[PDB]
């Protein structure tokens, strides 16, 4: 007894009669449908305004999916007879308005969706007789002002979404009687100037989003009663100044975000009573200098990221109360004349970026109290010299990085303490010759990299106390001869130098012929499938120049008989 137009399903584990009238070109509803249905799908069709008497004789329901389509009118008495309905969906129709009474026939509702419709001017008392609703979605509409007591009668509500709308004002009586709300969302609206008595009787809130609005003031006293709360968000706004009594009592808080604002200075004793934070973010603001004891009380932080302010000087004793801090970004602000002994106390760090700053030099007491580090970055400052006793304190260290500076030579007692290095990167400098013995202490090293310098010779006694290499690069360096000292290599790049193809250059030929996967010819660049069409190739060609009888030719293929007086 199915209308022979829809896929009729049957009992699976109960008496469900799921009727599938979804993807089909339909005009107004079919008839002769089953009476004992338990779920009905109707999305995708081209219906219009429903008749008042449409859904009677279906005293068992609980699913009325109606997304898509071209619906715009709900004539009165439309939902008459549905006493056991439990879900409803009207997502992407083009509705325009709802009169009073349309929800008087359907108590025991448990979710509602009116998301991408087109409607404004809610009435005063629609959602009444709905003391069991749990969800409510109203985002992406044209709402601009709400009367008082619009949410009247919604006792047991737990979620609420107002996003993409155009609200501009919040009177102090909107959220009244919502004693079990749990998540609020007010993003992407046009609010300004949070007042001081709105959020006072929501004693169970847990999330709060105020992401992208135009906010320029926050009265002192707001956020007063919110005992339980764990996620604030005020990222993209225009907050111009924090007072001392702006966060007075939010004990349980755990995540603040204040990026991309326009804060211009900090005060003596902000940020107190926040014994339980674990992440701060003060990103692209305009903070100018740090006074003594500005961060105080945040004795349990983990991440700071002051990464693009115009910070020009830091006094000794700024980072004071930060005990358990592990990561600090700091990279991008022109810290030219930093003092010394400024990082004392922080003996629990693990990673410190310092790139992008305009440092200049390194003095004997720059990094002193950091006997816990594991990763330094120092990429693009512009150093012209590092002193001899600068790194005698960092016992644990696994990666240096000095990529694009302008050093010209290294002191011969520099790596005395670093007995645990594993990555050494010294590209793109102006070095002229590497020291004679200053590579002894490195015993756990692999992955050396000295490309793009202007070296001129490598003696054999230089790479002997390194029995762990697996990677080596020498591109574009102006060398003439080389013999592979580490036998268990797995990579070699050698393109760009003026090699001399004579007798002493033969072990390289043998090693390249017997180990063709360690010294390849070319490897195919990365590709992701859509851009795999072009086969980008990185090259590795060895040329002969100093002898004119083998000039131009490659080494792997020259004659097989030139090495006969050799």
């Amino acid at each position: 007894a199915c209308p022979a137009a829809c896929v009729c399903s049957y009992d699976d584990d109960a008496d469900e009669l799921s009727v599938f009238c979804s993807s089909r070109n339909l005009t107004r509803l079919p008839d002769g449908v089953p009476g004992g249905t338990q779920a009905l799908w109707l999305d995708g069709n081209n219906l219009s305004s429903v008749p008042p008497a449409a859904f009677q004789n279906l005293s068992s329901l609980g699913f009325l999916n109606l997304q898509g389509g071209q619906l715009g009118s709900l004539e009165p008495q439309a939902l008459l007879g549905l006493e056991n309905l439990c879900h409803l969906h009207l997502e992407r129709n083009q509705l325009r308005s709802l009169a009073l009474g349309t929800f008087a026939h359907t108590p025991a509702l448990a979710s509602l969706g009116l998301s991408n419709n087109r409607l404004s001017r809610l009435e005063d008392g629609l959602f009444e007789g709905l003391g069991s609703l749990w969800d409510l979605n109203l985002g992406w509409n044209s709402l601009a002002v709400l009367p008082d007591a619009a949410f009247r009668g919604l006792g047991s509500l737990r979620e609420l979404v107002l996003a993409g709308n155009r609200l501009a004002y919040l009177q102090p009586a909107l959220f009244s009687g919502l004693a079990e709300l749990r998540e609020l969302d007010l993003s992407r609206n046009a609010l300004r100037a949070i007042k001081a008595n709105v959020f006072v009787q929501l004693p169970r809130l847990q999330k709060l989003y105020l992401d992208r609005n135009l906010i320029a003031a926050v009265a002192p006293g707001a956020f007063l009663g919110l005992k339980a709360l764990r996620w604030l968000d005020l990222s993209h706004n225009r907050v111009a100044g924090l007072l001392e009594d702006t966060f007075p009592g939010l004990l349980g808080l755990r995540v603040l975000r204040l990026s991309h604002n326009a804060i211009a200075s900090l005060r003596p004793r902000t940020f107190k009573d926040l014994h339980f934070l674990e992440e701060l973010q003060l990103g692209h603001n305009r903070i100018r200098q740090l006074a003594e004891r500005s961060f105080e009380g945040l004795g349990q932080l983990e991440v700071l990221t002051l990464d693009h302010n115009q910070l020009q000087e830091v006094k000794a004793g700024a980072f004071l109360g930060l005990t358990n801090v592990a990561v600090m970004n700091l990279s991008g602000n022109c810290l030219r004349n930093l003092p010394e002994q400024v990082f004392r106390g922080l003996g629990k760090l693990h990673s410190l970026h310092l790139e992008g700053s305009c440092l200049g030099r390194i003095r004997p007491h720059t990094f002193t109290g950091l006997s816990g580090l594991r990763r330094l970055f120092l990429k693009d400052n512009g150093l012209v010299g590092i002193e001899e006793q600068s790194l005698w304190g960092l016992a644990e260290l696994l990666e240096l990085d000095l990529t694009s500076n302008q050093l010209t030579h290294l002191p011969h007692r520099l790596f005395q303490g670093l007995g645990k290095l594993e990555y050494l990167l010294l590209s793109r400098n102006r070095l002229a010759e590497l020291p004679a013995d200053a590579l002894g202490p490195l015993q756990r090293a692999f992955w050396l990299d000295v490309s793009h310098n202007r070296l001129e010779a490598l003696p054999n006694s230089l790479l002997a106390p390194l029995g762990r290499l697996r990677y080596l690069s020498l591109r574009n360096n102006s060398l003439r001869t080389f013999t592979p000292q580490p036998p268990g290599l797995e990579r070699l790049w050698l393109e760009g130098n003026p090699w001399d193809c004579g007798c002493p250059l033969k072990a390289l030929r043998d090693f390249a012929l017997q180990n063709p996967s360690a010294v390849p010819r070319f490897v195919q660049a990365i590709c992701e499938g859509d851009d795999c069409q072009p086969p980008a190739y990185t090259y590795n060609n060895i040329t002969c120049a100093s002898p004119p009888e083998v000039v131009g030719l490659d080494l792997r293929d020259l004659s097989e008989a030139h090495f006969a007086p050799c």
């Binding site: 979710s111 985002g139 995540v255 992440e279 990561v327 693990h350 990763r375 797995e490």
Partner: protein, 167 residues
């Protein structure tokens, strides 16, 4: 309260053009598992099965061993039989899947959830969704989520993030 639905992309002559198509001679030519359109020959009854091998013959099922105490790993490594207090990672997963809930339909190559253990810390190594007998790119990271240098020797989309070796 319903969210989007994920479903594989309908392939066309483009796929068969990119996918080398030389089906060797055999009986009961079938399609390869997952959702990928490159025809191959089926397996017999009693040969190893898996997630990245071919699919069993007609009227057959690929079930793990009747013990092993670890089904999903045993099926990932190809050992089946054809038989008839936040952390650094939870804070990222949260606002990752808090964004995939306001959209309509999407494809299984647009999901980008990280891979981290049961204490909120990144695990060792990260990967990307596959497409049936063709895995995705992978790389190595550290505890807080910073990448490390590394190379490959077998080929692209392949790495062994050992204790510290990235061979």
């Amino acid at each position: 309260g319903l969210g989007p639905v994920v479903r594989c992309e309908p392939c066309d002559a483009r796929a068969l053009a990119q996918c080398a198509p030389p089906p060797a001679v055999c009986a009961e030519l079938v399609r390869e598992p997952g959702c990928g359109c490159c025809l191959t020959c089926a397996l017999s009854e009693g040969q190893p099965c898996g997630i990245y091998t071919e699919r069993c013959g007609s009227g057959l099922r690929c079930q793990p061993s009747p013990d092993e105490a670890r089904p999903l790993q045993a099926l990932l490594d190809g050992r089946g039989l054809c038989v008839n207090e936040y952390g650094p990672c939870r804070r990222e997963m949260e606002d990752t899947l808090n964004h995939l809930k306001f959209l309509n339909v999407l494809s299984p190559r647009g999901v980008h959830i990280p891979n981290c253990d049961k204490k909120g810390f990144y695990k060792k190594k990260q990967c990307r969704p596959s497409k049936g007998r063709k895995r995705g790119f992978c790389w190595c990271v550290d505890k807080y989520g910073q990448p490390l240098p590394g190379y490959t020797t077998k080929g692209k989309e392949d790495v062994h993030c050992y204790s510290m070796q990235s061979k």
